[PDB]
Structure formats: C-alpha cells, structure tokens
C-alpha cells in the first residue's frame, strides 16, 4: 500500500509521523496535528486558515454577497470524528490512485520531485529554502525542520474551491523556474460534484441537475497533476490563457481559461494550446533546467548536516534526470528533458486518469458544474480503492451506476444546485 499505516485521528502523537506542526506562512499560528502518510507527504485534517492569513474566516459572508456558485459551512471539519473520516478518506483516495499504473507513476514523480535547494545567496553553496519545510514538534517539545513535497489540507471558507497553494519567494518564481516548492492542496474527500452525461447539457449553464457524481479520486488526481507541474517548476503562468471561443456561454461573457488547466485536463482540451506557444514553454523550461544544472556545478559546499553535498547533488540529478560527464559536471540532455516534460504534462492528465479508473467524468474542462453533494467514501459498502462508487458484483458495478446519483441515491445528499446561477 502507498500508506503503510491506517492512522486514526486520535492516535497519540509520536513526533515522527503523527505530530503537531507549524507551517512557514510567515505568520503566527498554534501547532496543528498532522499525519505523515508517506515519505515527503503529509495530511493536515484542518480547514486551511494557515497558508493565507487573509483567509482565516470560515463564516460565510451575507447571503446577498455570496459568490453564487460556491459552498460555505463554517462547521465542516471542526470535530474529531470529521477529522478522522477526512484522514481515512484522503488515505483511501491515495490508495485508489496508487493502485493504477498511471497513479503509481505520478506519485513516484511527486515523491522524487523534491523542491530544489536554491535558498543560498552565495552560488558556491547549496542551501534549502525554509518555506519548503514544516516545523515538527519533537517528543522533547523542541522543533525540527523537515523537508516535504506535499501536504493535503482541508478547504478554506469556500469548501469547494480546491486548489494547489504554495509559498512564494521574494524573487524566485518557484513553480515556474524549474525549482519547485512544497505544495499544499486544499481538498476534501467529503463532497463531490454533479455533472451531466450529455455533452450539450453538461456544457450548458441552464441545463441539468447533476445526475452523475464525479469520482473524488479524479478530483484529487487533477490537483496532484498540478502539484507535479509545480514541484518540477514547470507550471504555466496563469496569465497565459485561452480566450474560449468554442462555447457561446463562455464566449458571451469573455471568460478565459488558463493553459495550465487545459494542459492538466488533457484530451482535446490540451489542443487549445497552439504548437507555437507550447514550443515556447518547452524551451523556457528547458533553459530553467539548464540553470539548475549550472547552479549545481557551481556548488562547492552544502549548508546543514542532515545530508551530504554529494547526496543532494545526486537527489537533483535524479529529479531532473541530468547527465554527468567525466568532470562530474551536470548538463541537461534534450531527449531526457523532453521525455520528463512530456511525462509530467501529457501522460499525467485528468483525461488519462479517467481511462484508468474506468469512471464517467466531465468530457471537457469547459463545462458548467450542476451541483455539490455530500458523500462518505470511508465505508467499504460505499466506496472502494478498486472500484470507487461502482462496486463490483452489485447493481452498481455496470454503467457507472455507482456514480448515478439517482440510482445510488443513498450515497449522495445534494447540498446546492448551481444550474441557472452562472
């Protein structure tokens, strides 16, 4: 299994994989109980009021001032039972993802995608960037800095605004300069979205009530894909967007969708990014990888005593798949760069995960959500690592009956309809 221990939220802290921690949010916070489910990966069963100090209020604004398509519940994830269920739900989704070859490949890439040690001002020394670490309270009550790649945390005020969040650098654009940074994914396994089986209905903002439910494993995978891009520092700048001209409803409102999202979804959506802008990005990131190889060559010493310079230089040789000549000098091989870049951007896509999970899912990112449902994937009678909602040897096994909220109604509680509110 990807997660070797089946944590219970109330398990006693041990200061190693169950501990109270603080994150580098450049602010003050009380320690929060966290769980290390795998090397470099932690889960914090708390609403995210930490990564962004300006988003510490879970209470919903006045009804007359609510972004109409959203969902608020200040009480969600406030009790121990909820946190226990959250932990078990997130763990289950990681196992479901890991159980597929594609998911195993993606998670392996994520674990190997250690944020680059580029926090040194002296080019002759290699140093870690503190914001790519968390402070773990040890048994003696002292704090120790631990590097990590990924954190899964609960959503902020708007429960359904799932997204990758990461700490920036004063000058370096870590998610776009090849360096990478620790990714905090706001996510919840306790809710999902309804979509429509007919394309003309799903992509219309006035039709459909959300007959089918999105498998949360796909939703998490989508975020993990963004995380992969960001950990390897190849995310596409959000200012690079597609001025949608294939959907009258999007078009009539001049709506734009980032290339990063289209790339992440994959399939036909990825084609909205023309060959010219794509060759542009590829060259840009190729050069960023070149700079990393260069920085490694100039490194003559390392800061800290946790690992050796040789060990860390090798860690990044593996991450970026660099080549080492006779002088021990690192260089970026075009074939290897293209292969890795393509893996992270074209192989790891939402559309491909749908193929591996064998689930029904939106056919394009350019659609309109229909509703949000409350769910509970923890009980095996409701959802499994192997079949999600479409349980084998039951009436829910075929035709995505498990995702059919009308047939499998006992597994979904519609909390809000979005149709007609865009």
């Amino acid at each position: 299994p990807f997660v070797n221990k089946q944590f219970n939220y109330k398990d006693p802290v041990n200061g190693v994989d169950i501990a109270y921690i603080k994150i580098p949010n450049a602010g003050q916070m009380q320690p929060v109980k966290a769980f290390k489910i795998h090397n470099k990966i932690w889960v914090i069963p708390e609403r995210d009021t930490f990564t962004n100090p300006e988003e510490g209020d879970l209470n919903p604004p006045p009804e007359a001032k609510q972004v109409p398509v959203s969902y608020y519940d200040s009480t969600y994830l406030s009790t121990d039972n909820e946190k226990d269920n959250y932990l078990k739900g997130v763990t289950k989704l990681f196992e479901r993802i890991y159980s597929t070859d594609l998911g195993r490949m993606l998670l392996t890439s994520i674990v190997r995608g250690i944020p680059f040690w580029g926090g040194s001002t002296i080019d002759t020394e290699l140093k870690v960037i503190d914001t790519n670490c968390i402070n773990v309270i040890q048994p003696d009550g002292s704090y120790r800095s631990e590097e990590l790649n990924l954190v899964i945390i609960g959503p902020s005020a708007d429960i359904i605004q799932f997204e990758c969040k990461s700490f920036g650098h004063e000058v370096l654009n870590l998610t776009r300069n090849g360096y990478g940074s620790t990714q905090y994914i706001r996510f919840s396994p306790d809710f999902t979205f309804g979509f429509e089986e007919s394309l003309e209905v799903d992509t219309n903002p006035l039709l459909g009530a959300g007959k089918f439910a999105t498998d949360p494993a796909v939703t998490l995978a989508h975020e993990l894909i963004h995380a992969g891009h960001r950990l390897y520092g190849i995310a596409i700048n959000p200012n690079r967007v597609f001025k949608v001209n294939t959907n009258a409803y999007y078009e009539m409102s001049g709506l734009e969708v980032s290339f990063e999202e289209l790339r992440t979804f994959g399939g036909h959506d990825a084609k909205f990014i023309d060959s010219l802008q794509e060759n542009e990005f590829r060259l840009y990131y190729y050069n960023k990888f070149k700079d990393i190889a260069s920085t490694l060559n100039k490194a003559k010493s390392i800061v800290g005593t946790t690992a050796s310079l040789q060990y860390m230089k090798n860690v990044f040789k593996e991450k970026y798949l660099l080549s080492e000549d006779t002088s021990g000098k690192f260089s970026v091989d075009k074939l290897k760069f293209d292969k890795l870049y393509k893996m992270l951007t074209e192989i790891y896509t939402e559309d491909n995960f749908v193929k591996f999970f064998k689930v029904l899912n939106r056919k394009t990112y350019l659609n309109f959500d229909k509703a949000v449902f409350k769910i509970n994937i923890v009980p095996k009678v409701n959802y499994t690592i192997y079949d999600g909602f479409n349980l084998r040897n039951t009436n829910l096994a075929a035709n995505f009956n498990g995702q059919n909220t009308e047939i499998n109604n006992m597994n979904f509680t519609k909390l809000k309809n979005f149709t007609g509110l865009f």
């Binding site: 605004q161 979205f193 989508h222 963004h226 969708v257 659609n367 959500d369 865009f422």
Partner: peptide
C-alpha cells in the same frame, strides 16, 4: 482547480 475545478473551474466553472
């Protein structure tokens, strides 16, 4: 991000 999920989008619209």
């Amino acid at each position: 991000r999920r989008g619209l």
